[PDB]
Amino acid sequence: HFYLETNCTIAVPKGEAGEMELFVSTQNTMKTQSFVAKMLGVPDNRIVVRVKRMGGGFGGKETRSTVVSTALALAAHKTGRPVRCMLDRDEDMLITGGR
Amino acid sequence: EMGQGLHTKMVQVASRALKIPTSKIHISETSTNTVPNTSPTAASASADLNGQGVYEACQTILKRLEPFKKKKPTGPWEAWVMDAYTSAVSLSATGFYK
Amino acid sequence: HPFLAKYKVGFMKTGTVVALEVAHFSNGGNTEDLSRSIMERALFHMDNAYKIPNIRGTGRICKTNLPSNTAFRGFGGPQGMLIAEYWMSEVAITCGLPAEEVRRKNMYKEGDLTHFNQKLEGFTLPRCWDECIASSQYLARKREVEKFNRENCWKKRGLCIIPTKFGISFTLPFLNQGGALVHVYTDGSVLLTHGGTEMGQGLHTKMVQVASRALKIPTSKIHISETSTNTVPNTSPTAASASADLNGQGVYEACQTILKRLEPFKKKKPTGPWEAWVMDAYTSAVSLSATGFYKTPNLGYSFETNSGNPFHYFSYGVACSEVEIDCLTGDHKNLRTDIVMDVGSSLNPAIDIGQVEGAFVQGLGLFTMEELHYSPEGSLHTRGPSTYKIPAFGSIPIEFRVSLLRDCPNKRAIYASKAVGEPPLFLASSIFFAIKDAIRAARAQHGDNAKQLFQLDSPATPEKIRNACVDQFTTLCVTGV
Amino acid sequence: LPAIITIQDAINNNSFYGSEIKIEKGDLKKGFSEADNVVSGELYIGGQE
Amino acid sequence: ADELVFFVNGKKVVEKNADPETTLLVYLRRKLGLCGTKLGCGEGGCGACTVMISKYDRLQNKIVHFSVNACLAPICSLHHVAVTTVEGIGNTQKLHPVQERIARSHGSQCGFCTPGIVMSMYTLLRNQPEPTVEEIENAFQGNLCRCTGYRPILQGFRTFAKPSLFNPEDFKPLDPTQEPIFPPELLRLKDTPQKKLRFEGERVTWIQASTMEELLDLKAQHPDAKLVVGNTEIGIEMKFKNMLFPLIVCPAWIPELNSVVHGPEGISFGASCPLSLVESVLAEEIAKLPEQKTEVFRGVMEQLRWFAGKQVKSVASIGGNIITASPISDLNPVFMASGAKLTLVSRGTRRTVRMDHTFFPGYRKTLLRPEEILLSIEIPYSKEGEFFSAFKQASRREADIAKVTSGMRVLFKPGTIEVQELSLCFGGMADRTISALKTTPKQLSKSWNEELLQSVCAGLAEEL
Amino acid sequence: SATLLFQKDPPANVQLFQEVPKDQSEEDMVGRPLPHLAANMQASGEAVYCDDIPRYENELSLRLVTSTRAHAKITSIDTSEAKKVPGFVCFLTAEDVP
Amino acid sequence: CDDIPRYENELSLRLVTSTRAHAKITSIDTSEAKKVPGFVCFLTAEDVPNSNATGLFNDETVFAKDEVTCVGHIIGAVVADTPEHAQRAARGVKITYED
Ligand SMILES: Cc1cc2nc3c(=O)[nH]c(=O)nc-3n(C[C@H](O)[C@H](O)[C@H](O)COP(=O)(O)OP(=O)(O)OC[C@H]3O[C@@H](n4cnc5c(N)ncnc54)[C@H](O)[C@@H]3O)c2cc1C
Ligand SMILES: O=c1[nH]c(=O)c2[nH]c(=O)[nH]c2[nH]1
Numbered sequence A: 001h002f003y004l005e006t007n008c009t010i011a012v013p014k015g016e017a018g019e020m021e022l023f024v025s026t027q028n029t030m031k032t033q034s035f036v037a038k039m040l041g042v043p044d045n046r047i048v049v050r051v052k053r054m055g056g057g058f059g060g061k062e063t064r065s066t067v068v069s070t071a072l073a074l075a076a077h078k079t080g081r082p083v084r085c086m087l088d089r090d091e092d093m094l095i096t097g098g099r
Numbered sequence B: 001e002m003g004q005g006l007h008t009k010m011v012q013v014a015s016r017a018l019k020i021p022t023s024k025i026h027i028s029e030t031s032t033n034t035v036p037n038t039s040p041t042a043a044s045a046s047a048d049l050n051g052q053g054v055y056e057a058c059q060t061i062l063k064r065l066e067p068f069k070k071k072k073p074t075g076p077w078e079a080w081v082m083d084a085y086t087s088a089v090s091l092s093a094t095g096f097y098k
Numbered sequence C: 001h002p003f004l005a006k007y008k009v010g011f012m013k014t015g016t017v018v019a020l021e022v023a024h025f026s027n028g029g030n031t032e033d034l035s036r037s038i039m040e041r042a043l044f045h046m047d048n049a050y051k052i053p054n055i056r057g058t059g060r061i062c063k064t065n066l067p068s069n070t071a072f073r074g075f076g077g078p079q080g081m082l083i084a085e086y087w088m089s090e091v092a093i094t095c096g097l098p099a100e101e102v103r104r105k106n107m108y109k110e111g112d113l114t115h116f117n118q119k120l121e122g123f124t125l126p127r128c129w130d131e132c133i134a135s136s137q138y139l140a141r142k143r144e145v146e147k148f149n150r151e152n153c154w155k156k157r158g159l160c161i162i163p164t165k166f167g168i169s170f171t172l173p174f175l176n177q178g179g180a181l182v183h184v185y186t187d188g189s190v191l192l193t194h195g196g197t198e199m200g201q202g203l204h205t206k207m208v209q210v211a212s213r214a215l216k217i218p219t220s221k222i223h224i225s226e227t228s229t230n231t232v233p234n235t236s237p238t239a240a241s242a243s244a245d246l247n248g249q250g251v252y253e254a255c256q257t258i259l260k261r262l263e264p265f266k267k268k269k270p271t272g273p274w275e276a277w278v279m280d281a282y283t284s285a286v287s288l289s290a291t292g293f294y295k296t297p298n299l300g301y302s303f304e305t306n307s308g309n310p311f312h313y314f315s316y317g318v319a320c321s322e323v324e325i326d327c328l329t330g331d332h333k334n335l336r337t338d339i340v341m342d343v344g345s346s347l348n349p350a351i352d353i354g355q356v357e358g359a360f361v362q363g364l365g366l367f368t369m370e371e372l373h374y375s376p377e378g379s380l381h382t383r384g385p386s387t388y389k390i391p392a393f394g395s396i397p398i399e400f401r402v403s404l405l406r407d408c409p410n411k412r413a414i415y416a417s418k419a420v421g422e423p424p425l426f427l428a429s430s431i432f433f434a435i436k437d438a439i440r441a442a443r444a445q446h447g448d449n450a451k452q453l454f455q456l457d458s459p460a461t462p463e464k465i466r467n468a469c470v471d472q473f474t475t476l477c478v479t480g481v
Numbered sequence D: 001l002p003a004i005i006t007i008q009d010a011i012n013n014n015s016f017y018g019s020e021i022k023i024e025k026g027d028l029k030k031g032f033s034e035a036d037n038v039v040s041g042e043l044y045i046g047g048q049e
Numbered sequence E: 001a002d003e004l005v006f007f008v009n010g011k012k013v014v015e016k017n018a019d020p021e022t023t024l025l026v027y028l029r030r031k032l033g034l035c036g037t038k039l040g041c042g043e044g045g046c047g048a049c050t051v052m053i054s055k056y057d058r059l060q061n062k063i064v065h066f067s068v069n070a071c072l073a074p075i076c077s078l079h080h081v082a083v084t085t086v087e088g089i090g091n092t093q094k095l096h097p098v099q100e101r102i103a104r105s106h107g108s109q110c111g112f113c114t115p116g117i118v119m120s121m122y123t124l125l126r127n128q129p130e131p132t133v134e135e136i137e138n139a140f141q142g143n144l145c146r147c148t149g150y151r152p153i154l155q156g157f158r159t160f161a162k163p164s165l166f167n168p169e170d171f172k173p174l175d176p177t178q179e180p181i182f183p184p185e186l187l188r189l190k191d192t193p194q195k196k197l198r199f200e201g202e203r204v205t206w207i208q209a210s211t212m213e214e215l216l217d218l219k220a221q222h223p224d225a226k227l228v229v230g231n232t233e234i235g236i237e238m239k240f241k242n243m244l245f246p247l248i249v250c251p252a253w254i255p256e257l258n259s260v261v262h263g264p265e266g267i268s269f270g271a272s273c274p275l276s277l278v279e280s281v282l283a284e285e286i287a288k289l290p291e292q293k294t295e296v297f298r299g300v301m302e303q304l305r306w307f308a309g310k311q312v313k314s315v316a317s318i319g320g321n322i323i324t325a326s327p328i329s330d331l332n333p334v335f336m337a338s339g340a341k342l343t344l345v346s347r348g349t350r351r352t353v354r355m356d357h358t359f360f361p362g363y364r365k366t367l368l369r370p371e372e373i374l375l376s377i378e379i380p381y382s383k384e385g386e387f388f389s390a391f392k393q394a395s396r397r398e399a400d401i402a403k404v405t406s407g408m409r410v411l412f413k414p415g416t417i418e419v420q421e422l423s424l425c426f427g428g429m430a431d432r433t434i435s436a437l438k439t440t441p442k443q444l445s446k447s448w449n450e451e452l453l454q455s456v457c458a459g460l461a462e463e464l
Numbered sequence F: 001s002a003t004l005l006f007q008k009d010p011p012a013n014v015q016l017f018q019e020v021p022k023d024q025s026e027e028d029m030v031g032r033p034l035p036h037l038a039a040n041m042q043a044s045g046e047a048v049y050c051d052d053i054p055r056y057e058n059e060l061s062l063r064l065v066t067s068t069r070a071h072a073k074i075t076s077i078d079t080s081e082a083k084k085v086p087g088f089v090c091f092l093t094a095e096d097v098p
Numbered sequence G: 001c002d003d004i005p006r007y008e009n010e011l012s013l014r015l016v017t018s019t020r021a022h023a024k025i026t027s028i029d030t031s032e033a034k035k036v037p038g039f040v041c042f043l044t045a046e047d048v049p050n051s052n053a054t055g056l057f058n059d060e061t062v063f064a065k066d067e068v069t070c071v072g073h074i075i076g077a078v079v080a081d082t083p084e085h086a087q088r089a090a091r092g093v094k095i096t097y098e099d
């Protein structure tokens, strides 16, 4: 896809009731939400996914964005601390696949 | 928004629907806690689907403003709106399309 | 807002009040803020619980070089009502009749019009009064008080039973509106929000409760995270005790809309679970998101014609309080308080009992403990707990009894409930007038006429209590004799 | 500059927010002239933080 | 050394550049991210910031536990102690019974005061696992709540003593064995002699002095060095009166400032002894000795009943109250009326003064020289025919500043009702603690009768 | 009673309220004493109040400056000492209001 | 997304990925990863609260469990203070494979 902005998630744990807020470069807030919820074992109403804008998607951020989102959601849940991951280009190109 | 100008288009749509300038309409972000259960931005479809949603949301507002528009057909948008507020009429609406 | 009142009441030898004139003045400080609506609410409650055929109240709001005063739980009602009860106390004393009989015979009945011409329907105050009389064992304890006072020269007890009426709805009618937004995600979980804010009154708790009944799902499947201008716009402040009333309706309407949209899927699988209806709705492309709104109907008072209903309904309650003052120091104990409060069919009796106690203890502070001091050039001196003495753990009535009135559904609010935040605060006036009762008795103990109308400003602090207990020590210290 | 602090300073200087608010019903002069007893007085109620 | 080392919720904290101006509340919240402990006033009156301190008391070879106001505790005072915050006793995954019961009994509304009240109650239970209803209410003298009206907090906690809103039978029981261990590292470290510490901040240097020699050398060299013990006065002067002491010395570690010596005439407390220790010592003596001997002790105990709450009395020193010399000190009138013996030392001088009117010449002053410190105060046994009362009236009974506060003593000629001595002392009636020196002398030799009552009242009316 | 040291009987509290209809569903909580939903979190210190929200690494602190006079003209303002404080950024006044 | 300012307490995550197309994970040695200043933790399948099953057809792992099935299969995630430290730590996760 070579979207010029690679995949990126910030997950912010809220400390109450399993509440978490994610800032994600994704075309799919819903699946991001669902996948993080299930991975944590909390209902969807606890998870908020926010997308301001992406520096390219082209279909590459329709689903494969969630492999970063989930890892990061977990780190945030575990540590009680905000966690962030933006993929390097080599990482993004290897992990996320293509046409 | 991923560079395809979706928000621009939806602002264009809402402006025509409400008959106000685009200057008075803003879109800040996309969020699971404002619109739930959204399909991905994909299949070239997102302006068609969201455009209709936006349209319908605007139609609901217009329907609520109608009586204040009849009473003051020329007096500006700001006046209708403040009138609806002080008459305790909702100025929030969802819209949806399949 | 501090208040100054000038009053003149006329009454019969029976204690029946036939004329009342009160001029009110508030210290508004250096911006207008809510000062005028506060003074309106004061004027609306200058009757407290009493029918007065000939009556005139005036209010003027002073513009001063002080920080701007604002809303405080009660919003001018407590100031209005203390004045009412102050002259009422003086009517009973002047008449030589018991306070509780003088108050009862001057009380409004069902169907009466207020001085502002609103009809009192569903008037439960007489029931609050009779239940509080019996449950507090008021007449028996009046004699026990009388006895203690014969047996003790330098400690005195006082017992007073006080009613209240409190009008529910913002005085500015269009503020009586609220909104909700509800999403059902595809796992069946619900995210709810409304215009109300949570400040300890358990509003979110009550709205989850409301939504859970409306949708017929457990409360565990519904969550509220926050209040936000970009989920519900144009919200009234969380104030006027009305937020459960307004948002409850809002939430209920949002929920009804979601139900209507699920009813085809329900009909197809009436046993099948909630989760299935939701996923069925989603995969049939039905919207699982809705707004809800409510405005309180038929409000709007005119000062010019003295017509229109400012309130949707009234709250009613009654408190009996007993105190024991130390006549030599001004210290006192709050021995026992008995409260009967109409909260309609409570949304949550734990939370409502919480609000009665919370409201009452703030009022207890207002009328007995809490005092702000300024330099003559207008600088607040009282700027922390070291100098500003709110009620402590040790301050509250030793025996503290609260009852919610039974079998009093209130049709016109959410699930027959009533608002609760503000109405109970004034009932702490019962401690103020119990103190006044004890002071009288201390004064009688030093050969003071007992139709003597000595001054007791609020708050009734140790200073004011001690100085009013005139004796050989106050006489020496002031006079030199 | 001259300060206005107390309610009485304000009455003295005609320093109010807007005009008198009033409610009156019935006939005061009659009520008072027909009563057995008349009791007048003043009350101050302090503010609250 | 210069490293500050303490424990928080069982976890070692090593701070390499402690700033004397940093409070424990700010360190917890902003350095450690533990925001359970709240800021409600910064003054010590609200308790929203209440946490527990645990430490090894070297003088008693035991582990002690007390509450403090974190808003007023300098981190520089906390070398080798162990702090417990609300996060330390439980969470929503495993609530401590204190936590469970306040929650389930509807004792949390806005919730802002709840951690504070939870830590006061928790601290009570670590000291007394079976408290009386009375001890429970007293745990909260330094805790304010604006929402609940207090009833449900007390009702819920009453379960720990000796159609319904909650079910106490469903409360998990408390097993005191399951509380966090005292950090073994702190028992390992109590085998090392305390060394002098120096901390340098932006504006303030703090010396934690290990010995009397170090303290007295410092005061001799640098008499402007400001003693800090509980910080319950100096904390207010800094935060609120914007006063700045660029050099502080804290002597709380020094044994001779912490000692409790029984003597023929009374009980000597080191100047840095906390009021809670004065309380615990005097309570024992009152309970065992004859009434005849404990009239002044009971005086002091009465004044301490209404002296803030547990948080302040755990760190507030007896010496601190005396030297502060507030016009409204509740203890100085009692010390004055009983003529308590004070010992004042510098490097190379030791003297004693009975507290009288000369001890306090002017506003907030004593007769201490710049280079002197107060070492000890002896609270006397009362003699046959010696009687004492203490009084305090404020705006609130509990945790208030006195309007008028007093100590009063009479000694009678033995076997008579004839006055030998009479001492009537007052706070809140001048810019210093005063004695009614004009009224009391003319009562000597008079009998304790109506005529004496009248003479004194008229005397006081004119004199004060 | 004048000589008595202060003493209080122990508390005696009674809370009366109406039971819901017995035909009401156990899942329907309206009229039931359900604890405040945040009570546990509020006992545990996990509930987040505004100042509990972590700071952004680039976050600044503000302190209001207020009048020490009831009524006066502002003749002049001197920020020269303020500017010497480490980490000082700016003093906002009326003229900064956009 | 990455232009959003970091919270003072924010942590960085770095994915650790399979270097074999198909192989059992014999062992994972984090011993070098822990020596890296800033290291917080290494997340694996065991740290997942609820479900390790994700993806649109539920046939994907959040983290590799027992076998890796592509070069770039996500095995775990390092958490550290900074991205530099997360990357270095990630290099100190030695994985043993059996093809
Ligand atoms: C919330 C609150 C409530 C309070 N309530 C009361 C009350 O009811 N009654 C009352 O009287 N007080 C009260 N106080 C005042 C304060 O608690 C006491 O004065 C306390 O005893 C001071 O002790 P400290 O160790 O904290 O002194 P610090 O604040 O450490 O020091 C106080 C002063 O004493 C000096 N000092 C300390 N030790 C020595 C020594 N050995 N030699 C010479 N100088 C020394 C210091 O240099 C300083 O000038 C209250 C304070 C707070 C914060
Ligand atoms: O009638 C009211 N209007 C308000 O704006 C308000 N605010 C409040 O606290 N109580 C009230 N009451």
Ligand code: FES
Pocket: E038, E039, E040, E041, E042, E043, E044, E045, E046, E047, E048, E049, E050, E069, E070, E071, E072
């Ligand atoms: S914040 Fe109020 S006592 Fe510490």
Ligand code: FES
Pocket: C200, E107, E108, E109, E110, E111, E112, E113, E114, E144, E145, E146, E147, E148
């Ligand atoms: S519940 Fe709000 S201050 Fe205690």
